[PDB]
Ligand binder design. Structure first.
Ligand SMILES: *[C@@H]1O[C@H](CO)[C@@H](O)[C@H](O)[C@H]1NC(C)=O
Ligand SMILES: N[C@H]1S[C@H](CO)[C@@H](O)[C@H](O)[C@@H]1O
Ligand SMILES: [Zn+2]
Length: 1014
């Protein structure tokens, strides 16, 4: 195993170092506005050294953006694919690349058999080539690596099954900024090459000057380079035709033959394309070849890539003809005129890369190595695309919830083979596809029109219901005596109970367990733990009486706490935000202990009076002018008082102090330690009154944030033996700090209501001497070092916070983990901040054609971990990565993959069992079974189950952390007959494993294994 902490990789380009050195001046470079006037030596190419030019036709098809997926499919994409089939079939030399498999699969299944055969033929023969092959071209900022893998696998599995092809070249021309998580997953999925486009215009200029636009992109901690993937970065402002033939768009636009008038398109530069004829072909070729040779100067080989396409292009037959015929005339002339020393032709993406590597092997070029990322993107001036790190936060949070439900549903149902009548595969396929579709760069990014966001939400809602059905049928089968088990596959044996989605104050969706002497004395509940290690976690349920006690299935009492059910109301009469308590529903909370990848059953029983093992929380409402708050049978009366500072401590955990406005002000780790200043504050950013306006994509603040005026907010303090909390009704946010004995959990119910042109930010102020350094994660996979640059505007210093961020000095670190991707930064030493929601009245000129005014209440969740790190073995000052501690990693897992809770629906569960998985190996804490998926239907004689294993890297800080078992996924199911290591998509076998044992992986590595069972 490579050491990912102590050896700083030596690479030719390290992006953080490059950023420290670059000046980012935005000067007018001439026709290439963000570059310079390229010059070339006409004698560079000659008869023995020609410039090979590959013109690659393409069509960017967004799976939803300004129309829904189905609307685009009906209006445009089905015509594009139908005409691509006809045109490629009839013109053997024409080529075309396709990226979005969600659309291709939709099209293909609707084709008649004769056309399906013609389509397979033009793919088999190389005319139509799939690039990447994912369900979509995903966002790379907000997406979790697990979902990037899910969608890649969804599209590639379909391609292998129906087209018999697996792409090894990736095409990502539109995500807004690029992440090294992509080459990481692709290189472990059989890929050999990738292409990217949206990178800061200053980065394009810098790399073009050094001919470093093609590089071997390795991970920031990779000393040896085994994770390296050849990458091609396009050089210009857009992938459209005007910005892909060369540096001068006024000239390139003349070679987009769809722009002469009849198609309703024209050239902004005021010079239109002209049909190629024998009389103008030499002058036209003169111009085009000169653009090509200038573009070729930016690269190292004599093989040149010229994409030819734009959004939803190649729709009409007439368009296919106008582009193909004109380009064929240009190729015939150019290739026959020796003085140009060029051989041009239509080609595919793979053809381009194969030729580039042939040149490389002939010793024609050596490529630089590079590590780092390409955030935050700016396409021009100060227009940094950091707004979409937060836009439509409700769906960004929904993404993480569905991410977990898909994993749990696939894992719970993988243990058994299911009759087709159970519709398990059917429901899982729908769930994977709707979550995969949302990974699109206009989905999770929050950059689609309102009705499209609604479509993605509805799709995700159906996917969550599909996951619930599969999960509850699985639980019933796993915990019922086999000879008693009698399933109705349409019946709901259990209802899922999720205390954080949609969340209290977002949707009253949770069911109350109704108990009563005259109706039902007890209820079974079951918890699932998808993580491969024993786990304890407090769980809560709503119940109809405060007199309830908990037992496990051996009837051992389990300590529990009952608290009221508090709901906050923006009182339109008193103009205050205050909580109301239920007089008929209560919350029962207790510690569940669940086996690795297992289940544990408990029973809640009512009694006529206070149970021996259940305690009741006290409640204190702080506000002037209080009114009574009755709580039905709840045994402790609510107490009142004027606002005042508060201090709380649960168990032996930290002691937290709060201001009289209910916000954290300090954390004391142990009884004797200092009360470390850690203050939460809410602020607001506005929009510029002159100049460019912020919108769904762009964050263009009118200066640093201003504090939100708090007034005299109502603060609710609930103190219990197992859980305490301080909640406060702030304008636009009910902020809650929850304590259960470790790092607190923070929940924000964010309702920006009608506050136009406002972005609400949550900031932490500490005295940690972090200076200009902070860390944020990339796709929940790795933490990368960031350096605040005052030479760049505020919005350029915002980065994606897909799952966590932290600041530290020599002794202290503060880490904020998230349950949803949002944008954030550290704008001053000792600070961390993360945007909660943004409501923007204006469109930001990127094509969406609307502002963001469809905000809805969202419950954002976090864990806040303050720790001493002076004893931790950290990377050196020059290392570009950072790593979490064990506590911070477990806190992240508590947010993204909590225990799942199931409530038995009927009155009696006959044949119920108390536990499942007690014999599953409890793996080391840094190892996770990211995916467990049965790959075969029940009719397969040989069953196959796939596993994706990921080991993160946690800092060594002096904790002995011992006793754990080796996890061999190939022996999790009985009767194993074969164990193979495969690509991460499970599509290719890489290694036949000895003894059918799957070796665990190294820190920061991810491997996939498939076990076969007889
Ligand atoms: C599928 O994969 C390769 C294509 O080159 C070939 O060996 C095989 O015969 C192809 N035919 C199938 C399985 O449809
Ligand atoms: N070409 C881009 S423009 C818009 C960005 O400006 C993007 O969000 C869409 O996904 C399109 O496909
Ligand atoms: Zn797009």
């Amino acid at each position: 195993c490579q050491d990912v902490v102590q050896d700083v990789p030596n690479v030719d380009v390290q992006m953080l170092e490059l950023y420290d050195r670059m000046s980012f001046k935005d000067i007018d470079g001439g026709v290439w506005k963000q570059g310079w006037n390229i010059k070339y030596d006409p004698l560079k190419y000659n008869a023995h050294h020609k410039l090979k030019v590959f013109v690659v036709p393409h069509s960017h098809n967004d799976p939803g953006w300004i129309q829904t997926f189905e609307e685009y499919y009906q209006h445009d994409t089905k015509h594009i694919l139908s005409n691509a089939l006809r045109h490629l079939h009839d013109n053997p030399e024409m080529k075309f690349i396709w990226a979005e498999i969600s659309y291709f699969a939709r099209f293909y299944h609707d084709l008649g058999e004769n056309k399906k055969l013609q389509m397979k033929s033009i793919v088999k023969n190389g005319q139509l080539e799939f690039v990447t092959g994912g369900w979509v071209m995903p966002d790379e900022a907000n997406s979790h690596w697990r979902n990037v893998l899910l969608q890649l696998t969804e599209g590639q599995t379909w391609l292998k099954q129906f087209m018999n092809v697996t792409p090894t070249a990736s095409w990502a021309i539109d995500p807004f900024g690029h992440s090294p998580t992509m080459p990481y997953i692709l290189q472990k999925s059989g890929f050999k090459n990738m292409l990217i486009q949206r990178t800061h215009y200053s980065v394009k200029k810098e790399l073009a000057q050094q001919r470093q636009l093609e590089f071997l992109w390795r991970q920031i901690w990779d000393n040896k380079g085994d994770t390296a993937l050849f990458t091609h970065m396009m050089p210009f402002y857009s992938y459209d035709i005007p910005h892909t033939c060369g540096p001068d768009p006024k000239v390139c636009c003349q070679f987009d033959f769809k722009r002469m008038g009849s198609f309703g398109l024209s050239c902004p530069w005021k010079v239109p394309p002209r049909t190629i004829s024998d009389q103008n072909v030499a002058a036209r070729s003169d111009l085009l070849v000169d653009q090509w040779k200038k573009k070729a100067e930016l690269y190292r080989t004599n093989v040149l890539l010229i994409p030819l396409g734009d959004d939803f292009r190649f729709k009409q037959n007439t368009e296919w003809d106008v582009q193909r015929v004109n380009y064929e005339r240009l190729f015939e002339h150019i290739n026959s005129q020796a003085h140009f020393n060029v051989q041009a032709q239509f080609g595919t993406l793979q053809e381009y890369f194969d030729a580039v590597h042939q040149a490389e092997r002939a010793g024609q070029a050596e490529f630089p190595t590079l590590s780092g990322d390409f955030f935050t993107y700016a396409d021009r001036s100060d227009n940094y695309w950091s707004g979409y790190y937060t836009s439509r936060p409700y769906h960004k949070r929904m993404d993480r919830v569905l991410m977990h439900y898909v994993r749990a549903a696939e894992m719970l149902s993988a243990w058994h083979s299911w009759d087709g009548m159970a519709r398990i595969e059917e429901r899982l396929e729908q769930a994977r596809r709707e979550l995969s579709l949302f990974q699109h760069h206009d989905g999770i990014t929050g950059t689609a029109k309102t009705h499209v966001v609604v479509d993605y939400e509805q799709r995700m809602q159906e996917a969550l219901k599909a996951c619930q059905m599969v999960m509850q049928q699985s639980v019933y089968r796993l915990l019922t005596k086999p000879s008693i088990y009698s399933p109705d596959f349409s019946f709901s044996y259990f209802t899922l109970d999720d205390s954080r989605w949609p969340g209290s104050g977002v949707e009253d969706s949770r069911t109350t367990i109704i108990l009563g002497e005259d109706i039902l004395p007890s209820k079974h509940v079951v918890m699932h733990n998808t993580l491969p290690h024993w786990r304890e976690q407090l769980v809560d349920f709503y119940v109809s009486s405060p007199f309830v006690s908990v037992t496990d299935l051996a009837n051992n009492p389990v300590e529990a706490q009952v608290s009221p059910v508090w709901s906050w109301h923006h009182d339109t009469l008193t103009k205050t935000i205050h909580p109301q308590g239920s007089t008929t529903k209560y919350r029962i909370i207790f510690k569940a202990r669940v086996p690795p990848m297992g289940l544990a059953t408990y029973v809640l029983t009512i009694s006529d009076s206070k149970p021996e093992h259940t305690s009741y929380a006290s409640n204190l409402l702080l506000r002037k002018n209080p009114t009574s708050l009755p709580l039905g049978q709840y045994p402790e009366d609510v107490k009142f008082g004027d606002p005042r500072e508060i201090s709380l401590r649960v168990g032996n955990g930290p002691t937290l102090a709060f201001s009289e406005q209910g916000l954290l002000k300090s954390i004391q780790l142990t009884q004797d330690s200092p009360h470390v200043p850690v203050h939460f504050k809410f602020l607001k950013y506005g929009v510029r009154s002159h100049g460019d306006r912020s919108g769904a994509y762009l964050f263009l603040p009118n200066g640093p944030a201003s504090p939100v005026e708090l007034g005299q907010p109502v603060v609710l303090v609930t103190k219990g033996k197992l859980e305490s909390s301080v909640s406060v009704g702030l304008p636009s946010v009910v902020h809650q700090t929850i304590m259960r004995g470790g790092a607190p959990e923070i929940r924000n119910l964010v309702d920006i209501g009608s506050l136009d042109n406002t972005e609400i930010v949550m900031r932490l102020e500490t005295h940690i001497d972090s200076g200009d350094i902070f860390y944020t994660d990339l796709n929940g996979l790795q933490f990368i070092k960031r350096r605040r640059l005052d030479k760049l505007p505020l919005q350029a210093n915002y980065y994606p916070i897909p799952s966590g961020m932290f600041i530290e000095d020599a002794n202290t670190r503060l880490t904020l983990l998230t349950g949803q991707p949002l944008g954030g930064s550290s704008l001053a030493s000792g600070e961390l901040e993360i945007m909660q929601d943004r409501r923007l009245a204006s469109d930001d000129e990127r094509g969406l054609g609307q502002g963001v005014l469809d905000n809805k209440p969202v419950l954002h969740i976090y864990r806040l971990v303050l720790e001493k790190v002076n004893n931790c073995v950290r990377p050196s000052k020059l290392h570009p990565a950072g790593y979490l501690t064990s506590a911070a990693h477990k806190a992240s897992q508590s947010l993204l993959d909590p225990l799942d809770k199931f409530i038995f629906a009927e009155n009696e569960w006959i044949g119920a069992q108390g536990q499942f998985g007690g014999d599953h190996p409890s793996a080391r804490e840094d190892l996770d079974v990211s995916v467990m998926r049965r790959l075969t239907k029940s009719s397969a004689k040989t069953q196959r189950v796939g596993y994706v294993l990921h080991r993160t890297n946690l800092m060594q800080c002096g904790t002995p952390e011992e006793h754990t078992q080796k996890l061999d996924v190939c022996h999790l199911l009985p009767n194993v007959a074969r164990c193979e290591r495969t690509t991460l998509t499970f599509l290719q076998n890489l290694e036949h494993l000895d003894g059918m044992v799957a070796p665990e992986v190294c820190p920061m590595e991810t491997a996939a294994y498939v076990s076969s069972h007889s």
